[PDB]
JSON list of N, CA and C and ligand atoms in Angstrom, two decimals:
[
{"chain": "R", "resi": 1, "resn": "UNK", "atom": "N", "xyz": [83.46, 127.01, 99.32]},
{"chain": "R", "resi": 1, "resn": "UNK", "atom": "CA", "xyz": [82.55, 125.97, 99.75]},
{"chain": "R", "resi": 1, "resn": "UNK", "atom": "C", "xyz": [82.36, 125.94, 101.26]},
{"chain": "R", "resi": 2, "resn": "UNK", "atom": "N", "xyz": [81.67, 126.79, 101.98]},
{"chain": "R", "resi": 2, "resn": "UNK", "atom": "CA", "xyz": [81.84, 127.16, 103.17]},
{"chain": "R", "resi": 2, "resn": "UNK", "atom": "C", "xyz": [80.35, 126.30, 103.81]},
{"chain": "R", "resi": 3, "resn": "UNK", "atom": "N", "xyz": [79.59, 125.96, 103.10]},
{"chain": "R", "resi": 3, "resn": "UNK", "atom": "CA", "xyz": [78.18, 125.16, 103.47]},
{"chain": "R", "resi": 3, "resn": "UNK", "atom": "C", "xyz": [79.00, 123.83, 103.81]},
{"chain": "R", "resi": 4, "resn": "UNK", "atom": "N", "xyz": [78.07, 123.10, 104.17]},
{"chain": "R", "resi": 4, "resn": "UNK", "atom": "CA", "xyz": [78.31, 121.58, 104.05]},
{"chain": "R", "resi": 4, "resn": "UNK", "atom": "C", "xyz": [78.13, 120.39, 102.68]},
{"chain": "R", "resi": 5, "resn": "UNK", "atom": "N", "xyz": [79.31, 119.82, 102.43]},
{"chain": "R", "resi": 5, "resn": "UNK", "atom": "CA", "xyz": [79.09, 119.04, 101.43]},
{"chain": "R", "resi": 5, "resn": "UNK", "atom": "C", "xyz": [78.29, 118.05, 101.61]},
{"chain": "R", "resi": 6, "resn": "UNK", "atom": "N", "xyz": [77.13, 117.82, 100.34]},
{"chain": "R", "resi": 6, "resn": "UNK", "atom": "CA", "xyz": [76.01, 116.99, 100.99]},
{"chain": "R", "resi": 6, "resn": "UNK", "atom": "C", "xyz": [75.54, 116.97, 99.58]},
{"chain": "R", "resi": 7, "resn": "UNK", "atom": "N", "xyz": [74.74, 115.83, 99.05]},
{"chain": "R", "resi": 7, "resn": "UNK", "atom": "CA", "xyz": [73.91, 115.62, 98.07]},
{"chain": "R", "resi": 7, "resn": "UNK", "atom": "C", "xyz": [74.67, 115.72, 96.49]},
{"chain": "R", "resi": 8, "resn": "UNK", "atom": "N", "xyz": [75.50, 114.47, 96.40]},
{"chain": "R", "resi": 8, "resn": "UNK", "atom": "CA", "xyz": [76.31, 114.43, 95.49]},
{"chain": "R", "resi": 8, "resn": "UNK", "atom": "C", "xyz": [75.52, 114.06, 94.12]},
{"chain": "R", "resi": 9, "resn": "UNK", "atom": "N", "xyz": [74.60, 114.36, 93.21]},
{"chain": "R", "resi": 9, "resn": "UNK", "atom": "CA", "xyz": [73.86, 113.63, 92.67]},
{"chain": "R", "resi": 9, "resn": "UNK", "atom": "C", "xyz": [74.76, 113.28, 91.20]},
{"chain": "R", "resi": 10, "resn": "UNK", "atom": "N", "xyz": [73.81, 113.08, 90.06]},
{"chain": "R", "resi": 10, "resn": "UNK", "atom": "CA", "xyz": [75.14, 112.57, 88.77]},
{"chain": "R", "resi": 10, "resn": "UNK", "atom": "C", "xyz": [75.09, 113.89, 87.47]},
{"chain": "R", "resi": 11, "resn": "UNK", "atom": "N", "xyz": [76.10, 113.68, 86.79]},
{"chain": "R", "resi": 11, "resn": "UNK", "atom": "CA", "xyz": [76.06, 114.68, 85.49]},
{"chain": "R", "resi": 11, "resn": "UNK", "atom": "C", "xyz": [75.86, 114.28, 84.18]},
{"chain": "R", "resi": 12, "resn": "UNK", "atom": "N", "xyz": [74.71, 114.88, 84.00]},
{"chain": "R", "resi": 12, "resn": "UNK", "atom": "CA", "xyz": [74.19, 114.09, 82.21]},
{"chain": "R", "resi": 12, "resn": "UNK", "atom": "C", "xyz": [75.82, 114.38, 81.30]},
{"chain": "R", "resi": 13, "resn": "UNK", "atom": "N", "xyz": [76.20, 113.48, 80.50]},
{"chain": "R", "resi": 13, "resn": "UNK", "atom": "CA", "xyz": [77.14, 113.47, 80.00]},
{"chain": "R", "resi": 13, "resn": "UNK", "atom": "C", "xyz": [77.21, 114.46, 78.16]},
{"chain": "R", "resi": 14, "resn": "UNK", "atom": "N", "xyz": [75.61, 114.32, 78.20]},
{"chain": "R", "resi": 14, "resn": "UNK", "atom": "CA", "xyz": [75.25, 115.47, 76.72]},
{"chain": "R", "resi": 14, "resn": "UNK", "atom": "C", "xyz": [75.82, 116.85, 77.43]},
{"chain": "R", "resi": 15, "resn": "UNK", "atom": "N", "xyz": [74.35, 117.09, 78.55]},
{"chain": "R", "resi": 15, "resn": "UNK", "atom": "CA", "xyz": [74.23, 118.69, 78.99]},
{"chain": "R", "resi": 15, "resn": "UNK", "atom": "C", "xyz": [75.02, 118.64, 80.90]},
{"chain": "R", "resi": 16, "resn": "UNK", "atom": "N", "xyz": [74.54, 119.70, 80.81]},
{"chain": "R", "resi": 16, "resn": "UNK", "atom": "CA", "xyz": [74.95, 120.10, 82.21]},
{"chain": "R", "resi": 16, "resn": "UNK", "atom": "C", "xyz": [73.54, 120.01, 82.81]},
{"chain": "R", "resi": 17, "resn": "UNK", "atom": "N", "xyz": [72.80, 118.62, 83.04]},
{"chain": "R", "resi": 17, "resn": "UNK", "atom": "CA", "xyz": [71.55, 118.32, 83.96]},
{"chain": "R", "resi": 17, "resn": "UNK", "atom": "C", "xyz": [71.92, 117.07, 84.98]},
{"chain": "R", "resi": 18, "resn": "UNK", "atom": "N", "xyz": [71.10, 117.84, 86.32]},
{"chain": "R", "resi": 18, "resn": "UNK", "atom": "CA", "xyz": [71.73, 116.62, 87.12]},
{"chain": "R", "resi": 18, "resn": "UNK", "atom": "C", "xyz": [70.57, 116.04, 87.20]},
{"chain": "R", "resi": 19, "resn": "UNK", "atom": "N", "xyz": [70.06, 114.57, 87.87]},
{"chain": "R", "resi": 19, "resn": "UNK", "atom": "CA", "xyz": [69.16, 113.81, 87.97]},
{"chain": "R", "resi": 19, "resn": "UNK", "atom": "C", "xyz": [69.60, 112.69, 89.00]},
{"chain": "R", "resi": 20, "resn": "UNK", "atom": "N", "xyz": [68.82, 112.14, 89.55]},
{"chain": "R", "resi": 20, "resn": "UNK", "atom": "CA", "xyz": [68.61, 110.83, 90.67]},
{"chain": "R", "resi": 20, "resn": "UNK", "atom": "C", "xyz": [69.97, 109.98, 89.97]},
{"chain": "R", "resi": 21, "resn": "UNK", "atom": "N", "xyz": [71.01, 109.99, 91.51]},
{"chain": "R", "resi": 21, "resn": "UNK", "atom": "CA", "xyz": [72.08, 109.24, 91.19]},
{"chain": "R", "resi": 21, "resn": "UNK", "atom": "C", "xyz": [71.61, 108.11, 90.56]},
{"chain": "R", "resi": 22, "resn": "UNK", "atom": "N", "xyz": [71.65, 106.97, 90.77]},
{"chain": "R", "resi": 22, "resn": "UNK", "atom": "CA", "xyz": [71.50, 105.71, 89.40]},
{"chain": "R", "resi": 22, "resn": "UNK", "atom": "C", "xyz": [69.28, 105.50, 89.15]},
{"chain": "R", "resi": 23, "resn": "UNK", "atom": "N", "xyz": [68.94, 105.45, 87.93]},
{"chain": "R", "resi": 23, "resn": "UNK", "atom": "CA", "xyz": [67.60, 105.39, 87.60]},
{"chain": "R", "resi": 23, "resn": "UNK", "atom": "C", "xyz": [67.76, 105.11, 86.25]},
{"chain": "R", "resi": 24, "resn": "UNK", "atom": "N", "xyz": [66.62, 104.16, 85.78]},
{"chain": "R", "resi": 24, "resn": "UNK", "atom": "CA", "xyz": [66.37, 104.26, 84.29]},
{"chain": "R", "resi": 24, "resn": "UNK", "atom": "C", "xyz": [65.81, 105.34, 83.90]},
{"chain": "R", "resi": 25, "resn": "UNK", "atom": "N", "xyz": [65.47, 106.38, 84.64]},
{"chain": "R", "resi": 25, "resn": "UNK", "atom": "CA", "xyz": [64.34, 107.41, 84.53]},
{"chain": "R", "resi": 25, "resn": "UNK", "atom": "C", "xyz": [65.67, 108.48, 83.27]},
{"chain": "R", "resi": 26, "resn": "UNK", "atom": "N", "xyz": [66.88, 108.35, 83.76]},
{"chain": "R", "resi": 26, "resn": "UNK", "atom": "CA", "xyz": [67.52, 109.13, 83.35]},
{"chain": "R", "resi": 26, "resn": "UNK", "atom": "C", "xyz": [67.93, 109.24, 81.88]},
{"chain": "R", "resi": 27, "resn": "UNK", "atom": "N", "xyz": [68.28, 107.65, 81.84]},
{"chain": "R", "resi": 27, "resn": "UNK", "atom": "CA", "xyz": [68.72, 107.31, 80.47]},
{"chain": "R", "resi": 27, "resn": "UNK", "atom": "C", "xyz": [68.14, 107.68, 79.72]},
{"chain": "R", "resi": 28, "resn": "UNK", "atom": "N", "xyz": [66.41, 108.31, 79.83]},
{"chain": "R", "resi": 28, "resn": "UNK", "atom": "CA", "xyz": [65.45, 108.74, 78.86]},
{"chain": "R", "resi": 28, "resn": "UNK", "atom": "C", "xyz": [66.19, 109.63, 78.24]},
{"chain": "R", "resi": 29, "resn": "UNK", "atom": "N", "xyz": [66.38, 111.04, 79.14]},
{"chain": "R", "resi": 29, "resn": "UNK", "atom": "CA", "xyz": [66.72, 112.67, 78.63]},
{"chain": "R", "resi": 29, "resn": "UNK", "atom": "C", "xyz": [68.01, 111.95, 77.76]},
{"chain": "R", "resi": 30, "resn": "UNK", "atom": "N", "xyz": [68.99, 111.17, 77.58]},
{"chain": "R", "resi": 30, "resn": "UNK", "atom": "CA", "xyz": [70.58, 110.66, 77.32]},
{"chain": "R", "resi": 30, "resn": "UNK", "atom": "C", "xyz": [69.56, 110.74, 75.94]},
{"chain": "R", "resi": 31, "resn": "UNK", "atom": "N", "xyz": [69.05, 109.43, 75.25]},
{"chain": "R", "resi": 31, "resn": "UNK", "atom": "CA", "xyz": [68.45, 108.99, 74.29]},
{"chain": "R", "resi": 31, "resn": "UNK", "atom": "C", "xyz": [67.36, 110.45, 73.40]},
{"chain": "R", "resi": 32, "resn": "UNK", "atom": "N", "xyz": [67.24, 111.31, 74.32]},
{"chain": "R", "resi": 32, "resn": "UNK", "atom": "CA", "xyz": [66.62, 112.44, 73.64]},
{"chain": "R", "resi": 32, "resn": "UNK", "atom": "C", "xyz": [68.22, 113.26, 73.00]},
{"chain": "R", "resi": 33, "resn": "UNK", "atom": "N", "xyz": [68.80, 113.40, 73.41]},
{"chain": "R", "resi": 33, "resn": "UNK", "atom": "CA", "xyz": [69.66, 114.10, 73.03]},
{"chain": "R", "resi": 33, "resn": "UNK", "atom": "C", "xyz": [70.18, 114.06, 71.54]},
{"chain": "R", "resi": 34, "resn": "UNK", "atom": "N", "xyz": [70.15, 112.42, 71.50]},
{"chain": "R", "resi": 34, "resn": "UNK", "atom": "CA", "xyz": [70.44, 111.86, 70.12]},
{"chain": "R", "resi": 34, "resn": "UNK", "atom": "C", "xyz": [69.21, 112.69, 69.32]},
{"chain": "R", "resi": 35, "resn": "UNK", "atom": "N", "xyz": [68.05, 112.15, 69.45]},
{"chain": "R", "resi": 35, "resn": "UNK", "atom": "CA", "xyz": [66.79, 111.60, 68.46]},
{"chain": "R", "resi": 35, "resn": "UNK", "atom": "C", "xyz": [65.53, 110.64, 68.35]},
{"chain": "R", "resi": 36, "resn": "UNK", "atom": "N", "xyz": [65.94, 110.48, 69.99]},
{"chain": "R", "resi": 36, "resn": "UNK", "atom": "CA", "xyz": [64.91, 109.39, 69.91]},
{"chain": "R", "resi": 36, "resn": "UNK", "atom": "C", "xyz": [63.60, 109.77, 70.07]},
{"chain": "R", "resi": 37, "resn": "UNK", "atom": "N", "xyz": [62.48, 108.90, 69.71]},
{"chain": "R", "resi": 37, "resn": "UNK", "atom": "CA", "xyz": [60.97, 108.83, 70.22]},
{"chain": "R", "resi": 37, "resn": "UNK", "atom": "C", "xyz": [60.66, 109.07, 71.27]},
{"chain": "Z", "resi": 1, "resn": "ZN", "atom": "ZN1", "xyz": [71.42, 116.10, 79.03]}
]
């Protein structure tokens, strides 16, 4: 890790996708994972 640590964002807990630390935007892809509409 020889760069600079910077831009910690979050980890979908299904897959390995990161997305905008806290958003409702996210919870969408969560709810696809299941089945949803
Ligand atoms: Zn995911």
């Amino acid at each position: 890790g020889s760069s600079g640590s910077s831009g910690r964002a979050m980890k979908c807990p299904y897959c390995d996708f990161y997305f905008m630390k806290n958003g409702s935007d996210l919870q969408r892809h969560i709810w696809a994972h299941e089945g949803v509409k």
